[PDB]
Write a protein that binds this DNA or RNA. Structure first.
Ligand SMILES: [K+]
Ligand SMILES: [K+]
Ligand SMILES: [Mg+2]
Ligand SMILES: [Mg+2]
Ligand SMILES: [Mg+2]
Ligand SMILES: [Mg+2]
Ligand SMILES: [Mg+2]
Ligand SMILES: [Mg+2]
Ligand SMILES: [Mg+2]
Ligand SMILES: [Mg+2]
Ligand SMILES: [Mg+2]
Ligand SMILES: [Mg+2]
Ligand SMILES: [Mg+2]
Ligand SMILES: [Mg+2]
Ligand SMILES: [Mg+2]
Lengths: 206, 117, 202
RNA sequence: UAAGUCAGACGCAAAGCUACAAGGUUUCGCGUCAAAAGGAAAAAAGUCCGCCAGCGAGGCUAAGGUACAUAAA
RNA sequence: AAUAAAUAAGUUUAAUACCUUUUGCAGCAUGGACCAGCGAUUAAAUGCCGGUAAUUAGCAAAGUUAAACUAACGAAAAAUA
RNA sequence: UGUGACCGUUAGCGCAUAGUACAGUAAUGGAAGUGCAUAAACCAAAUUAAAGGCUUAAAUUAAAAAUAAAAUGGCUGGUGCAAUGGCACAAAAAAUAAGAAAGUUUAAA
């Protein structure tokens, strides 16, 4: 066989990809020769006795107060920036000539995994109108879109309704009717939603 | 730690159980090798002492002293060392005496490349 | 040691098993058959495959699994002997193992992309060594094992090796020709193997 | 290094305690040992000189020595 | 501590075992009569920090899971016209 | 029955058959032990070395073969090699469940 043939008997790994394990207790001139590098006596050198976090008895970490404030439920939403929405449209992954819904965002790749809804935030300088329906929005995003002539609508969906919006084929392939939309939201959420979402959204021209 | 073959090679001339018993021979082998490191260092000190004694004995037979000779050689720019000087006194008495006479009296005839300038 | 054109397509003749004669010519994609050969990737995939195949049905017994050994065999003090707690201790002849073996799996994971790089390196290596051959079919016109051997010998006469590997489109391919090839191939053949393209490995 | 260590000792020089005692005890400045082979003082952990990668039958010195033991007036 | 370094082979000089434990052990501190065999940081899951690669990862097979990214002050004027 | 980067007589099951021999009033505990061959510790035997004068000119050889101390006698059973013995799961089969309570169900031609 020539020198450049490759077979099972001349394979090696890339240098630096592996290193030999240290086997302690194997001689005076070996690494960690006799006492295995643990010292001479004490609690640390007698096996699994001492937790690494014990501080000797002072217990300094539990001398601090406790806070019980509950964070807002909106930390469970997926956050979408206005600047990221525009980039997708410019590249051509989103159609800006029709109403944009969360289904389009999911398929385009703007949002990864939705369980509750999408929150739209940020500032952006636009030159063309955009019509987008989301579950939540801040004021900076609303001003940016409306400045160019767009419309931002906050839509209320339930657990079953959100499934129909995102995966309608999951129901038609099984010959099942689509979920029905909600009637109204609890008054405690007044000022959070503008309209009740329709499972098949009504697309319009922009 | 030395192996059985190494231990018994070193201990082939030892006495009693030190020859063929591993535990006994191993400790005897290591102690001996420690003696050898010290032995080589001391050898260089002892031999130089012996050279000086022989030179001093030769000097005093003629009425001189070792310390006077060493000083005298450095004034003449003669760089013979003690190993050579020791051997001259024992085996070449006539040449050893000639060196002493030059240092003490400086009555040697100088040699030039051109005998007749 | 010679000049190689990387990423360039290759033109390869097609031979016939029945008579060992050239029949046509085809083309090989340059990204698969003219790629760089990664020696370190081949090493990783080979280790990956060997680890997966290891069976790992092995076990031993520790001091708690060996028979007996419950009672304390000697008094703690007074006898002049060493203190002992059980006869099945690791220090005792016939005792348990300090760290027993257990049935276990040895397989680890690799990305699917790294496996692809290995396959391309292996296919590219064969072409650069002149050990890659293409045939129209394996069973058309051949009715005996000896006939197939002679044809393969004629096709691969210009090579250094001895053993051969045959790849087809699976049993249910080429009008179920694979079934005939399996029947013809003798049992316990140490120098010839037949695989489908789905089971090809580095 | 998310490692080991939290038993230290003595010499010269000061102070508290003891009796301006202890190879005592408590602090403090420098050094040595601990973890340091080699040379001088008798043996010589802590004093004086001085820091051993290896070999050699070359040379010059330190502390200390120069009628015998024992190298050199 | 039964050796070492040398030698004219007569001899001369150097030289208080090892381990463990200690401020300090030739130790009048601890363990070993000798030989052969056996006898002690191993495996799984998860986390942190280096190294070496892939250039998102897993399924599925034009569609879905996991991760990652996502507004901060639109501030430069370099024209031998 | 099938497979093994599982073991190969201090290993692997306690057992290359033995829950036997043996210990104990009893419950109970629980061994050793394959075949072949200059291994070690261990006990006896083994010290040394001498040598001083035939007169020289026409052989031999089918062919081949044939002159030299690495190792005393023992006791013991390590090491090396092999398997009619073990270990782990897999396949097939087996085992197993009913609501009701002296009452009807589940049958492929
Ligand atoms: K450590
Ligand atoms: K013995
Ligand atoms: Mg301590
Ligand atoms: Mg400690
Ligand atoms: Mg066992
Ligand atoms: Mg303390
Ligand atoms: Mg303290
Ligand atoms: Mg004191
Ligand atoms: Mg210490
Ligand atoms: Mg001088
Ligand atoms: Mg003198
Ligand atoms: Mg003490
Ligand atoms: Mg004892
Ligand atoms: Mg055996
Ligand atoms: Mg057994």
């Amino acid at each position: 066989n020539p020198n450049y043939f490759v077979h099972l008997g001349n394979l090696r790994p890339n240098p630096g990809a592996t290193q030999q394990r240290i086997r302690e207790g194997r001689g005076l001139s070996s690494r960690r020769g006799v006492s295995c590098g643990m010292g001479f006596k004490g609690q640390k050198a007698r096996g699994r006795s001492l937790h690494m976090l014990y501080d000797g008895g002072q217990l300094g970490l539990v001398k601090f107060p406790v806070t019980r404030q509950i964070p807002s439920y909106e930390v469970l939403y997926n956050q979408l920036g206005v600047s990221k929405l525009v980039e997708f449209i410019q590249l051509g992954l989103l159609d800006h000539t029709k109403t944009i819904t969360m289904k389009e965002l999911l398929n385009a790749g703007c949002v990864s995994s939705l369980k509750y809804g999408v929150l739209l935030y940020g500032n952006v300088s636009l030159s063309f109108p955009i019509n987008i329906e989301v579950t939540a929005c801040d004021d900076r995003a609303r001003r940016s879109i409306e400045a160019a002539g767009g419309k931002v609508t906050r839509v209320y969906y339930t657990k079953d309704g959100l499934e129909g919006l995102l995966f309608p084929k999951r129901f038609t392939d099984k010959n099942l009717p689509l979920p029905r939309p909600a009637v109204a939201w609890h008054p405690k959420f007044d000022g959070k939603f503008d309209a009740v979402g329709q499972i098949p959204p009504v697309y319009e021209a922009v | 730690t030395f192996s059985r073959e190494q231990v018994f090679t070193f201990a082939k001339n030892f006495t009693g159980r030190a020859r063929n018993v591993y535990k006994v021979a191993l400790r005897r082998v290591e102690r001996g090798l420690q003696h050898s490191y010290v032995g080589r260092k001391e050898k260089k000190r002892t031999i130089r002492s012996l050279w000086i004694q022989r030179i001093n004995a030769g000097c005093r037979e003629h009425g001189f002293a070792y310390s006077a000779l060493i000083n005298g050689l450095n004034q003449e720019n003669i760089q013979l060392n003690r190993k050579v000087l020791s051997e001259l006194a024992m085996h070449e008495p006539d040449s050893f005496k000639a060196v002493l006479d030059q240092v003490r009296f400086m009555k040697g005839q100088e040699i030039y490349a051109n005998v007749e300038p | 040691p010679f000049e190689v054109e990387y990423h360039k397509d290759r033109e390869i003749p097609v031979c016939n098993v029945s008579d060992g004669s050239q029949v046509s010519t085809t083309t090989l994609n340059g990204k698969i058959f003219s790629d760089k050969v990664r020696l370190d990737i081949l090493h990783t995939v080979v280790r990956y495959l060997r680890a997966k195949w290891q069976q790992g049905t092995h076990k031993t017994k520790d001091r708690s699994e060996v028979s007996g050994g419950g009672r304390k065999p000697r008094p703690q003090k007074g006898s002049g002997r060493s203190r002992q707690g059980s006869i099945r201790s690791p220090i005792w002849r016939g005792g348990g193992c300090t760290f027993p073996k257990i049935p276990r799996s040895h397989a680890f994971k690799l990305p699917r992309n790294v496996v692809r790089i290995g396959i391309r390196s292996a296919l590219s290596a064969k072409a650069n060594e002149g050990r890659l051959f293409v045939v129209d079919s394996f069973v058309r016109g051949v009715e005996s094992y000896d006939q197939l051997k002679a044809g393969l010998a004629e096709v691969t006469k210009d090579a250094i090796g001895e053993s051969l590997l045959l790849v087809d489109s699976g049993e249910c391919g080429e009008d179920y020709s694979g079934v005939k090839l399996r029947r013809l191939l003798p049992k316990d053949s140490p120098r010839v193997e037949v695989l489908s393209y789905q089971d090809l490995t580095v």
